[PDB]
Amino acid sequence: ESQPDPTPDELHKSSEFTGTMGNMKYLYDDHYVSATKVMSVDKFLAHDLIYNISDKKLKNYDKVKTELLNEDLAKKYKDEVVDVYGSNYYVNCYFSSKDNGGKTCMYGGITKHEGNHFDNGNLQNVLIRVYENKRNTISFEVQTDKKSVTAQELDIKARNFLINKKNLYEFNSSPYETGYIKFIENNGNTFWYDMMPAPGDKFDQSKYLMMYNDNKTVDSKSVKIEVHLTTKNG
Numbered sequence: 001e002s003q004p005d006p007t008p009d010e011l012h013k014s015s016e017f018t019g020t021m022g023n024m025k026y027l028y029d030d031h032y033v034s035a036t037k038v039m040s041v042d043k044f045l046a047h048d049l050i051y052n053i054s055d056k057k058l059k060n061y062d063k064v065k066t067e068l069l070n071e072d073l074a075k076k077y078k079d080e081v082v083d084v085y086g087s088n089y090y091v092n093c094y095f096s097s098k099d100n101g102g103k104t105c106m107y108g109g110i111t112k113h114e115g116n117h118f119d120n121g122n123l124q125n126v127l128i129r130v131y132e133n134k135r136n137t138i139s140f141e142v143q144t145d146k147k148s149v150t151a152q153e154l155d156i157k158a159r160n161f162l163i164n165k166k167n168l169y170e171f172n173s174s175p176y177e178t179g180y181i182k183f184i185e186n187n188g189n190t191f192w193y194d195m196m197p198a199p200g201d202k203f204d205q206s207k208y209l210m211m212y213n214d215n216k217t218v219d220s221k222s223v224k225i226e227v228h229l230t231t232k233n234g
């Protein structure tokens, strides 16, 4: 059922990442694609959906392509009126089956609009507990207007806060050696994401965000979230 917690040796170590940590920071620092009540208008590969979504802010795109884990998810949402929320990237963001107004890519991040909001039109708060070297140092709340929200949306909002409050990621590196965000559902299921970039000297944004392609959703009203970081070394 649930995924076992991280073994000590498998977690990505920032001390083993020689690339630019700023490239990771870019993915969660006041950075996200947001849309409400849209319906895909085209596809590239069998498991993706393309939406007409405009970048309100910087005006960097008007078309968004989101890849999903498989064809089945793609078909399920293809003609559905959905809401979108996720972290987009541009490096190696491919469109066109020949030749197929900026364009941007992402993974998962979709939820049906109908029946997914709170009756009193309010927002749901989700508690994030942060642990540094096994100690719960701080805890903060993030908000969502969805009853069933993608884990991606909650993760992004959590890291955006931590980037500012705890300098989770800086341009050169991170003050933390290890880090993972763990979700705990009210049915007992748990799963987590490694918050650090894979070892090497070149961060692959596309490859890292791919973990969100399962379009995993959780019940905002009952899910629990824990961020576990370590400075372990220095």
Ligand SMILES: [Zn+2]
Residues within 6 Å of the ligand: 036, 037, 082, 083, 112, 113, 114, 116, 117
């Ligand atoms: Zn909606």
